[PDB]
Design an enzyme around this catalytic site. Structure first.
Site, mmCIF file in Angstrom:
data_model
loop_
_atom_site.group_PDB
_atom_site.id
_atom_site.type_symbol
_atom_site.label_atom_id
_atom_site.label_comp_id
_atom_site.label_asym_id
_atom_site.label_seq_id
_atom_site.Cartn_x
_atom_site.Cartn_y
_atom_site.Cartn_z
ATOM 1 N N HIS A 158 0.791 -1.231 0.000
ATOM 2 C CA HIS A 158 0.000 0.000 0.000
ATOM 3 C C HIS A 158 0.822 1.279 0.000
ATOM 4 C CE1 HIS A 158 -4.407 -1.060 1.285
ATOM 5 N NE2 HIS A 158 -4.251 -1.023 -0.024
ATOM 6 N N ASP A 184 -9.822 -2.390 2.353
ATOM 7 C CA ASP A 184 -8.679 -2.791 3.158
ATOM 8 C C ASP A 184 -9.193 -3.224 4.517
ATOM 9 O OD1 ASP A 184 -6.174 -3.201 4.356
ATOM 10 O OD2 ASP A 184 -5.523 -1.147 4.161
ATOM 11 N N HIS A 235 -7.512 -2.360 7.055
ATOM 12 C CA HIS A 235 -7.029 -1.268 7.874
ATOM 13 C C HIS A 235 -7.400 0.049 7.211
ATOM 14 C CE1 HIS A 235 -4.456 -4.829 8.320
ATOM 15 N NE2 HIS A 235 -4.496 -4.534 9.605
ATOM 16 N N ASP A 257 -5.220 2.578 7.013
ATOM 17 C CA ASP A 257 -3.955 3.073 6.463
ATOM 18 C C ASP A 257 -3.865 4.596 6.487
ATOM 19 O OD1 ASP A 257 -2.828 0.626 6.108
ATOM 20 O OD2 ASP A 257 -3.253 0.478 3.973
ATOM 21 N N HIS A 269 3.366 1.167 4.681
ATOM 22 C CA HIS A 269 2.160 0.568 4.133
ATOM 23 C C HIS A 269 0.951 0.902 4.985
ATOM 24 C CE1 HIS A 269 0.992 -2.810 6.830
ATOM 25 N NE2 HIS A 269 2.247 -2.705 7.227
ATOM 26 N N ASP A 326 -6.987 -4.051 -1.298
ATOM 27 C CA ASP A 326 -6.006 -4.793 -0.529
ATOM 28 C C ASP A 326 -6.494 -6.225 -0.362
ATOM 29 O OD1 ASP A 326 -3.948 -5.579 1.080
ATOM 30 O OD2 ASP A 326 -4.095 -3.882 2.477
ATOM 31 N N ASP A 369 -5.613 -8.216 2.221
ATOM 32 C CA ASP A 369 -5.885 -8.626 3.589
ATOM 33 C C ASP A 369 -7.254 -8.172 4.057
ATOM 34 O OD1 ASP A 369 -5.396 -5.877 4.057
ATOM 35 O OD2 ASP A 369 -3.703 -6.197 5.347
ATOM 36 N N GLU A 391 -0.256 -5.785 -1.434
ATOM 37 C CA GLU A 391 0.028 -6.656 -0.291
ATOM 38 C C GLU A 391 -0.092 -8.142 -0.604
ATOM 39 O OE1 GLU A 391 1.030 -6.052 2.868
ATOM 40 O OE2 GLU A 391 1.219 -3.889 2.548
#
Lengths: 317, 214, 317, 317, 214, 214
Positions: free
Chosen positions: D99, D122, D124, D126, D139, D230, D232, D275
């Site tokens: 990221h 995502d 998260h 970020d 990231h 992303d 994850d 990622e």
């Protein structure tokens, strides 16, 4: 009762699909005790046995369609047996095998009930013709021999001289489509068949999908429902021991919800459990999960709700 | 897991009539198995794809049958380019076993081996070794037992054999009897015998030499 | 704060259920750091320690109910400790163990708050009586000692002379039912207990289920909520190391959503985490997934939303 | 067509995140045949190759932010290449990597379209700053260099002198948040960014989430959508071979539904697949599931609906 | 899986100037690897964390470089407390291999071993054993081949050696040649030779004794 | 994994009074373990299901106790049909270990073995073998060490022993000492000794024979 009066028809047939091993379809589903797990709740289970499928030696293929005569004779024998068990007023539980048997399993059902509606739960549409296929496997072409609107786009495949197209395009519902051919999607959008692919299942949720499905088939007139259930339409984390698994499928919760909502109409009149392949589990645990999933789907078709069931007597005695 | 058994383990048929083979399954493979033509030192060429139908570039004569437990492979017009090991392969059950091997030999009037022996070189005695090899050349069929002896008392665990493929012209075989001894065990004994035994030999042919005889 | 003021009560008790090993219930949930993972956000965590459960030697069973006196004494000791930690104005986090402790864990909670409502998240109803059971395990009979309407259908089980029925049939909500006895389903339909089995959870979705649950309990009057959470009610892909796992359960997302919506009422007043069995994971990775799941459920009960949490000071400094 | 006119930009970059191995990001996504799987449907795929990322030797860190100059130079080189492929009228498919590249991958996209909207799928947010981070990994800080409202709360990090903040707080949508820092959640609630964490995804369902997302970004004015995806954010049962997996994520069904609803707007104008880490799968089967998932997400971004696709000619010939 | 190779396998440098080491990777670890200071019998102390930057309590002199395949470790101010085995560790690829070992010895003028032998005790002959140990003391460098012989015919598979660490003061080494025989094989032969060979020894030093000589 | 230990490894008690046994756990099984009655050559019959309560067809006398680490099994009315190996089984922890074995023998006044030896047959010498078996019959208790010797020098790695179950009537034991030699090693030596040792034998009984003596 009117429902859960089951006549089981085994059909150990494999010559539609390439992965040999679905001949242990009824053997493994019976040795997991489908009969005994039906017989607790009020199920008049009558086993009609596995069918004897002969081995035609000179099974010369079509252009791309391969083993045509064996599949045609197998579905004719199955349609005779399904018409026999529907003249006894039962619910024609057929369990194979592969989707190539569903030609006979819907035709013999339509010999008794000409106004049935098919809920075709499958990862695939199985609506390929002998002209638009690429594999040529007959587990991918059962629907296109059955639709009345595809009369004329089907060549005279040997062994299928008996097949009369029995259902219409607006009387079949797909639930769980996630791997559709370009020819299959063109047929599916030309005929206007109401389909609930995994986009619509993720959008609406399985409650709204089953509500719109039962309103689409049973909203105009109460009629027999023929759930033709495939075990690759469920997600391969739940049934990995199937023929053509496609990831991102219906969860085991959603499959049980589909079968429970079909039962609570009380209009189930034929069940098909196809493409169970116990020789493809990488562990025996994978085969165990697949067969327990398919048995739980059948039991929830015939009354076993997840909320629980009781016999109508007082238990506080 | 299905064991695929082939009933002719070996085969020797002269260029001529039919050479029908066998492949028996342990279950019902049901018209889903294949046939191959692995020549020695080559890739296994495909003969038949699913129990018949003559897969795409086969000349005229390799039809077969089956459906569904014990299968056949007919070589109706034998054609002596076809002298190769044939394999049957089940495919519609996993894991995917093959057959055993169907080494179609050449069938001639049984040839006697030229049983010949050689001492190790004196160059090898300057190295510390002793390799006594008895060469048996131009015999048919394959089966020869060769016995090495310590001046008449038999030898084990040092004998190596190298069989040839069947020759193109005389259709015979050839074989070394590679026996390796040390420098010390060489100098202890003299008469080094090669007791050969072929079907053409009514008596076991013993070829020998003394140490430092020639 | 008013919520997230936790008094942890360990209860390493196993003599209700057969699979011995849930005695390492509080040991494994504490060695995974439930206390330290609570202490980041504003949690006044006070560990009241594990309880000393004696071993009654002449634990003569009932007809089918087995180990009755040990479970009765364990729940009386637990109810005393829960009444102690609720006189301190905390939230009685009890974590065992097995569901047989929930008799005391709800009775001691009702000694302080007589008008509580139980959200019983479980795969099972656990509403068997000593007359209608088949297993006779007391992890399947905690509810039927607690309901006021079942006074008279319960024999005087030894060790349970202290149990006063404390909640009514319309003050308990089941979420996640997918394995219900015939006697359990008959009791559940006779008393009219509002239950959300996996059919209704698949239909409505967990948002509508939790909205109807909180409207059913807290819609008339704000009252303490006692979430009695079982770890087999979640799907065994997330918690395989439990006592009686039943496939097709609540996903880990849906379990965290249930606990977050219970927290955002701000009326949580007792939490039960039962049936964690670390000796049944086929790998230690299975035990690790089970315990991390149960710890994440407890943390989302006490404030850890998945969207994130911040202390009320400026962070851009 | 206007959409599915792809310019692929590889970006094998790893110096934002600690787990070295995402340098085989474009290598594994190309050797799984993303180009060839795009080229069946009408995709004018033009590979612009992997970028040459230099190795700055004296990469002296910041206070907590580590490797700043390498990430700044990598994102400047990427933003130049993205502006190049958007002057060709294509869709800037960037695929890394991590990221940390999304700074350049959104800045170069905003050099051509200044009014874009970012769907940041995502686990998260970020949205950490160089002052509020704890890891210091870049990231976890791509968004806070891009937001216009965070001008002034960002120190002059070396290598990021070129970064102009390009999007506003009300033009970015998070889908799939389940691991948010306290500083990240404070920024996310101060700026008022419309976020759909896993609480809201479990509540509303992915149909209502994607409907509200597209109504939030495209309801006022049709504008380019830059899906920065992303791997994850999906559940680690589907993509375990990622950098920072967080359990309880979006299912593979829901991820495909997000990308299909982004495609059916026809306003996709940049895709980021970050990622992917093939060196972290415990088996090669885990890497195979991760890469097949990310490839299926990209294909469903560029037209492959799960219901099926056909070329606009008659197939019944 | 990346093999990390260190080019100085051993090293001997006197307290003084630079002692730059090597750690070559099999891929691009790219400035993500470390350095260690495992003293003998100790925990491996960290030197460098990511190719530079001198991790938190290192005195003044252990700078390194890299980025990204073949790395260095400079010991600019050698400081003879630093005589320990050094290890390089890649970290940003799994699994996490280390280096090989970089045993920085002490560098003096090469010392001759005091090749001395001892018979087994008569106490050991009352037990049934015979341990003949030839002690080689105060040598530098390490490399000595010791040959045991059955009155002149060499011995195998009973010889054990115990090398010391390098001594603090004279920077030499010491070594036992632990040869264990039975009571019977002891009494069969007399002259028990210790053929030692060091670089200071132009001839192979043979130390011997007869049985029951002393 | 919990090791279940039984403190009487063997047991010999005459038909009569109590024969209380022991089963110690390595953790707290807590009144969840069982007891069994495996007769020799039979299926293990269940005695006690969970530390008490006399499972369903036990006569009158097999009560036990526990709760929860070291358990007992009381045989109050011994009843000599009950001479069988008893096993304790933990169940409420996986994996499900059993005990060790509690071989309740018969307790009589210690009997002397009839130490008798036999040569191999001359029929066996025509085969190439030599099986020298010393039969020890009607002894109590079990423990006998039998030593074979090459005319006085002991024998190893050819000795086989076959112990009986305890006899029903005289409550004794029987044992072969199956020693197998070759034809060559038979003809090398004559005096083939059977050094038997029983507790009734104050001296080690040596039974011997010469080769071709009888």
């Amino acid at each position: 009762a009117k429902s859960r009066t089951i006549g089981i028809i085994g059909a150990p047939f494999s010559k539609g699909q390439p992965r040999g091993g679905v001949e242990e379809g009824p053997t493994v589903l019976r040795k997991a005790g489908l009969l005994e797990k039906l017989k607790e709740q009020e199920c008049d289970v009558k086993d009609y046995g596995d069918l004897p499928f002969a081995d035609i030696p000179n099974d010369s293929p079509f252009q791309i369609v391969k083993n045509p005569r064996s599949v045609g004779k197998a579905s004719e024998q199955l349609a005779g047996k399904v018409a026999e068990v529907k003249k006894n007023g039962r619910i024609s539980l057929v369990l194979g095998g592969d989707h190539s048997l569903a030609i006979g399993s819907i035709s013999g059902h339509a010999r008794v009930h000409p106004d049935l509606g098919v809920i075709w739960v499958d990862a695939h549409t199985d609506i390929n013709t002998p002209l638009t296929t690429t594999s040529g496997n007959l587990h991918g072409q059962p629907v296109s021999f059955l639709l009345k609107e595809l009369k004329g786009k089907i060549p005279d495949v040997p062994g299928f001289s008996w097949v009369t197209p029995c259902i219409s395009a607006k009387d079949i519902v797909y639930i769980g489509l996630r791997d559709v051919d370009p020819g299959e999607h063109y047929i599916l959008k030309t005929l206007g068949i109401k389909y609930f692919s995994m986009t619509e299942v993720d959008r609406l949720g399985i409650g709204k999908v089953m509500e719109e499905t039962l309103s689409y088939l049973l909203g105009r007139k109460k009629r027999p429902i023929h759930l033709s259930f495939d075990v690759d339409g469920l997600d391969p984390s739940f049934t990995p021991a199937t023929g053509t698994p496609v990831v991102g499928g219906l969860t085991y919760r959603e499959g049980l919800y589909i079968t429970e909502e079909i039962y609570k109409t009380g209009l189930l009149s034929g069940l098909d459990i196809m493409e169970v392949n116990p020789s493809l589990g990488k562990t025996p645990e994978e085969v165990t999960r697949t067969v327990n999933t398919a048995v739980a789907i059948t039991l929830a078709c015939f009354g076993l709700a997840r909320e629980g069931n009781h016999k109508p007597i007082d238990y506080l005695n | 897991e299905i064991v695929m058994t082939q009933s002719p383990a070996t085969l020797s048929l002269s260029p001529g009539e039919r050479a029908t083979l066998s492949c028996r399954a342990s279950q019902s493979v049901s018209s889903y198995l294949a046939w191959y033509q692995q020549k020695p030192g080559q890739a296994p060429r495909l003969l038949i794809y699913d129990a018949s139908n003559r897969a795409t570039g086969i000349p005229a004569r390799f039809s077969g049958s089956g459906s569904g437990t014990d299968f056949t492979l007919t070589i109706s017009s034998l054609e002596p380019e076809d002298f190769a090991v044939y394999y049957c392969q089940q495919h519609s059950l996993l894991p995917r076993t093959f057959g055993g091997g169907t080494k179609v030999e050449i069938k001639r009037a049984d040839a006697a081996p030229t049983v010949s022996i050689f001492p190790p070189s004196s160059e090898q005695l300057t190295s510390g070794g002793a390799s006594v090899v008895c060469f048996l050349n131009n015999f048919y069929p394959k089966d020869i037992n060769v016995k090495w002896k310590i001046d008449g008392s038999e030898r084990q665990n040092g004998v190596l054999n190298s069989w040839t493929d069947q020759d193109s012209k005389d259709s015979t075989y050839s074989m070394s009897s590679t026996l390796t001894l040390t420098k010390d065990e060489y100098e202890r004994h003299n008469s080094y015998t090669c007791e050969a035994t072929h079907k053409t030999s009514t008596s076991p042919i013993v070829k020998s030499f003394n140490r430092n005889e020639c």
